Design a protein around this ligand. Structure first.
Ligand SMILES: O=C(O)[C@@H]1O[C@@H](O)[C@H](OS(=O)(=O)O)[C@@H](O)[C@@H]1O[C@H]1O[C@H](COS(=O)(=O)O)[C@@H](O[C@@H]2O[C@@H](C(=O)O)[C@@H](O[C@H]3O[C@H](COS(=O)(=O)O)[C@@H](O[C@@H]4O[C@@H](C(=O)O)[C@@H](O[C@H]5O[C@H](COS(=O)(=O)O)[C@@H](O[C@@H]6O[C@@H](C(=O)O)[C@@H](O[C@H]7O[C@H](COS(=O)(=O)O)[C@@H](O)[C@H](O)[C@H]7NS(=O)(=O)O)[C@H](O)[C@H]6OS(=O)(=O)O)[C@H](OS(=O)(=O)O)[C@H]5NS(=O)(=O)O)[C@H](O)[C@H]4OS(=O)(=O)O)[C@H](O)[C@H]3NS(=O)(=O)O)[C@H](O)[C@H]2OS(=O)(=O)O)[C@H](O)[C@H]1NS(=O)(=O)O
Ligand SMILES: [Ca+2]
Length: 370
């Protein structure tokens, strides 16, 4: 009988549409390392009558680089936002091709909410007693959607390029995350141009050429464990073009609850914290999250209207129903000053250059209006 079933298909949501065989349970796509044990359907642990999702990253499963040199991180998550082939059906072939280049493929897919909207989210997590108290992982996060056609020229001027102008720039610039490098033709030992799986030319990253594109950035909301604490962290970035060098980020252990750490353009708030030992183990915990996203002033870079965060934590204890109003309708700055909105993800995002093993289950996602 089936116990655990590995779900190994992975999708690059920013640069590729998901194929039908990669979609999980009709509403998810997986991102991160493809190890069989990374993500598995779990028939031994049902949530609401359906097999749950078991996530696991062993000590050597980090495959990503952090912002600081040498630092690493790991990822095995599900994204509720992705585009499918049906999303591009009927359109000229170049729409999808340009979307791959601008890495905005998922802008054509379902799963994201608009800027400044009000939404309800719900999901459940199961933390086994085997989880080490000192893990450094985010198990649920709401990510932003920056459009890289917003760039900074070598001079330092911020400019919103058209898709075609960005395509033009991309022809001479190789982007490593948000930083532009001279696009160098990659040759083999015999100085011959290298191709890939589809016979498409391959390139290399030369020296920095001064260009920067909007990319990355802290997730506006994250649920996780760090420094022996369960915490909920909200982030706000009002700058039109995000500055990745501004590392304004609240420390769960050192930052007081609901007292935002701020820089000129960012605010990072620890909305709630709890000792890891007090987080219920070996049972399903359901979080009901309501978010009123902060409204930003675009080019003006102003906070037009503050946001709002509300969180309820429900679980069974002593056979009794428990519901903790852990974040009580708190006015807060939450979101990013972008044209597009946000999407949900859950699973494992091991950060802080940690390699402590992580394993837990997630299930029952739902979102609605309010
Ligand atoms: O290619 C290659 O390489 C290769 O290939 C092949 O070969 C293979 O592959 S396969 O697949 O085939 O196999 C391999 O080999 C490879 O691949 C691999 O790799 C690659 C590359 O990588 S690298 O890394 O190298 O680059 C890859 O690819 C890539 O990547 C990917 C990924 O990543 O995934 C992608 O990307 C994309 O996507 C993503 C995701 O999404 S999805 O949807 O898909 O999922 C995106 O995003 C990202 O991420 C995000 C998230 O997740 O969130 C973000 O991040 C961020 O945020 C975070 C968090 O926050 S919070 O608020 O929550 O917290 C952070 O973290 C944090 O923070 C930190 C800091 O700050 O740092 C910390 O804090 C701390 O510290 C600080 C500082 O201090 S000092 O001292 O230093 O001063 C302080 O202040 C404070 O206080 C503290 N705190 S405590 O508490 O600690 O005390 C913290 O901690 C943390 O956390 S916590 O929680 O703890 O808090 C971060 O940071 S870091 O550092 O970590 O980094 C952030 N970041 S940033 O930058 O922003 O800053 C974002 O958004 C992002 O990131 S990034 O990095 O990425 O940016 C993105 O965006 C996208 N991009 S696009 O372009 O697309 O758009 C893709 O694909 C790519 O990218 S690219 O660019 O390249 O294109 C791949 O994937 C792989 N593959 S595998 O398989 O291997 O895996
Ligand atoms: Ca922006």
């Amino acid at each position: 009988t089936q116990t655990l079933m590995p779900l190994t298909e992975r999708v690059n949501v920013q640069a590729d549409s998901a194929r039908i065989n990669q979609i999980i349970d009709g509403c998810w796509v997986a991102v991160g390392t493809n190890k069989p044990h990374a993500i598995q359907r779990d028939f031994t642990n049902l949530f609401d009558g359906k097999p749950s999702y078991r996530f696991e990253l062993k000590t050597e499963d980090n495959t990503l680089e952090g912002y600081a040199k040498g630092e690493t991180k790991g990822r095995a998550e599900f994204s509720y936002c992705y585009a499918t082939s049906d999303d591009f059906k009927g359109l000229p072939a170049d729409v999808y091709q340009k979307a791959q280049i601008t890495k905005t493929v998922y802008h054509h897919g379902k799963g994201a909410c608009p800027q400044g909207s009000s939404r309800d989210y719900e999901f459940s997590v199961y933390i086994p007693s085997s989880l080490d108290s000192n893990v450094s992982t985010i198990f649920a996060q709401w990510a932003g959607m920056p459009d890289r056609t917003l760039v900074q020229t070598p001079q330092g001027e911020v400019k919103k390029l058209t898709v075609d102008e960005f395509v033009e720039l991309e022809k001479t610039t190789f982007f490593k995350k948000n930083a532009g490098h001279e696009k160098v033709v990659r040759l083999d030992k015999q100085g011959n141009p290298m191709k890939d799986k589809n016979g498409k030319p391959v390139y290399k990253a030369g020296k920095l050429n001064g260009w920067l594109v909007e990319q990355g950035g802290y997730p506006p909301l994250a649920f996780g464990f760090s420094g022996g604490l369960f915490y909920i962290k909200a982030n706000s970035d009002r700058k039109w073009l995000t500055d990745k060098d501004d590392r304004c980020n609240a420390n769960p252990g050192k930052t007081p609850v609901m007292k935002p750490l701020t820089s000129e353009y960012k605010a990072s708030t620890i909305a709630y914290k709890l000792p890891f030992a007090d987080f219920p183990k070996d049972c399903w915990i359901t979080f009901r999250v309501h978010i009123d996203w902060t409204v930003y002033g675009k080019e003006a870079e102003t906070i037009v209207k503050p946001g709002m965060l509300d969180v309820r934590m429900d679980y069974q204890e002593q056979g009794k129903k428990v519901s903790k109003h852990i974040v009580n309708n708190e006015k807060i700055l939450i979101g990013r000053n972008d044209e597009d909105g946000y999407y949900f993800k859950f699973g494992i995002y091991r950060v802080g250059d940690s390699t402590v093993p992580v394993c837990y289950n997630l299930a029952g996602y739902s979102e609605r209006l309010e």
